[PDB]
Amino acid sequence: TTFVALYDYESRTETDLSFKKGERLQILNSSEGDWWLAHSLTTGETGYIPSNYVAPS
């Protein structure tokens, strides 16, 4: 249920969470799901996608 930060992390966008090594973190359930780095074969664009929006080919 609970995780611990292994390294510092500085936020890079409005939506990520900054934390320090040692912080205790609780994972939450969103409707979008986990986010994956993806490349669109249709458009050539790249970036993070919500896993719950996609299904295997």
* Interface ranges with a copy of itself (CB under 8 A): 1-7, 9, 11-20, 22-30, 34-43, 45-51, 53-57
Dihedral sign from CA coordinates of 31, 13, 17, 54: positive
**Distance in Å, CB of 43 to a copy of itself, minimum:** 7
**Distance in Å, CB of 46 to a copy of itself, minimum:** 6
46 φ, ψ (degrees, to nearest 5): -140, 145
> Which of 22, 20, 8, 17 lies closest to 35, judged by CA?
17
**Distance in Å, CB of 12 to a copy of itself, minimum:** 7
